[PDB]
């Protein structure tokens, strides 16, 4: 059976989510609209900015993440920020399509739509996979939750301070994730460790996107095309 | 430095 | 009559200024929407953002403008940037609206829109009568587009290090607009006295500008909004 | 400093 302690965080943590994301996609209209030189980079660099703040608002209602100084709750989020949206994004992923299909004709993201951003497909190849492997898993919403917090919580991060601190958070975390499969998700008998599998999976695609983005943000150009909250989230300062 | 990310975490 | 280094110095001012400006106005579907906190500041920032771009295009082709050192073209673009945008913005200014009139109702912006972008009447009030100012002058193509370089081109810039050269250049200009205005503009005989004069209130509204952006750039979750083409040309460094 | 004004400049 679990804790009180222990659903109390899955509580508020499902909460939270259902405060961050909203499932109809309304707020895309508010973008820079999208084209279909780069075209795609305006409206996607405008809906990553979107999302960062989403995630913000996550990680402040995460138990614990409040109380570390705001140096690791920076360091944290410039890290695990790419990888907390390619989670997010999972809820719009859709296997009929291969795109993430957050609204009609407009708001649909194929694959060429990723690459008039101004990333290769040695990005886009991993990217998709990780997103059927992820969609395969049928996920409940306390482990798609859960999951992020974890991600979040990695102590592997550059820049953070006080890992054993919040090292302590994920691993209170992970508890309550193998608590909650092994007494509330049926047929989960290798889900916890199928899951932390995925973790591996995002640090990979971490680096690869990195990788592009900083080619991506040294050409002028490209760069005036981004939200200051991108730069600076993804710039190193 | 960081003047965003510092203002959203409240 | 007009000399052929006069009328040269026309012909690339009057066709720079063609291929910088577009009357339909076409290319707003592609900045981030209006909305009517601060709704209106995304779609402005997106526009002032866009015209820096059609500014520097036109400099470039300013006869004597590329030859200066890049410091004393960047130096004379970020003091004169928002001015020649509020000379270049007549052009959409109606009387019969007292608006921008920019397209139908979206992109007509109002004086309650300005101030939905951050701005206090201290600025509203002298921006307006400088435009009905200048669209009394009733000025022809070749006097908005002389004025333009004429005010860009000004001396009294911080930053300018060359102030003799770039001196001698905005009177090369004063000197075509004086003869142009003398020769082809019937019932001119005091034009050119109140041109000068509408680059003192310019000043004036362009420190008025400064005051209200520098105390919106020091709020996170506004410069938030701008796009770095703005961030780079109003800030200091 | 300015690396897009200085892009836009050529
Ligand atoms: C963001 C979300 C959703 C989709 C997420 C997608 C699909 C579109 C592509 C991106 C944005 C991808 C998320 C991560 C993979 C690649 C993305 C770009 C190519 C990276 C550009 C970033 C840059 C320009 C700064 O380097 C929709 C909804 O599920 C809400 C969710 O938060
Ligand atoms: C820009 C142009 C046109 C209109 C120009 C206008 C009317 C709308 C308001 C602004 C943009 C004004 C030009 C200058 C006065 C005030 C403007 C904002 C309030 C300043 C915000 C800038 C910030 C947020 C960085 O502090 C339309 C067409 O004529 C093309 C032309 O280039």
Redesign the interface.
């Known amino acids: 059976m679990l804790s009180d302690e222990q659903m109390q965080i899955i509580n508020s943590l499902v909460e939270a989510h259902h405060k961050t994301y909203d499932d109809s996609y309304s707020d895309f ?5 999208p ?1 279909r030189r780069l075209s795609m980079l ?1 409206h996607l660099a ?1 809906l990553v900015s979107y999302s960062i ?1 989403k995630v ?1 608002g996550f990680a ?1 209602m995460i138990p614990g993440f409040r109380d570390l100084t ?1 140096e690791d ?2 360091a944290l ?2 890290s695990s920020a790419i990888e907390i949206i390619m989670l997010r994004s999972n809820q719009s992923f859709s296997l009929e399509d291969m795109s993430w299909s957050c609204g009609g004709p407009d708001f649909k993201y194929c694959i060429n739509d990723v690459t008039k951003a101004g990333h290769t497909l040695e990005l886009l190849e991993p990217l998709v996979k990780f997103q059927v492997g992820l969609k395969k898993l049928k996920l409940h919403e306390e482990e798609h939750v859960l999951l992020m917090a974890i991600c979040l919580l990695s102590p592997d991060r550059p820049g953070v301070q006080d890992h054993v601190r919040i090292e302590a958070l994920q691993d209170r975390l992970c508890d309550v994730l193998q608590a909650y499969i092994r007494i509330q998700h049926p047929g989960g008998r290798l889900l916890y460790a199928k899951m932390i599998q995925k973790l591996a999976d995002l640090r990979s695609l971490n680096e690869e996107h990195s990788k592009q983005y900083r080619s991506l943000s040294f050409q ?2 490209h ?2 095309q ?4 991108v ?3 993804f710039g190193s ?1 | 430095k960081h003047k965003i990310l510092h203002r959203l975490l409240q």
């Open positions: 209209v508010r973008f820079r609209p084209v305006p405008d703040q913000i402040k705001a709750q920076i989020l410039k002028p150009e760069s005036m981004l939200t200051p909250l730069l600076e989230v300062e």
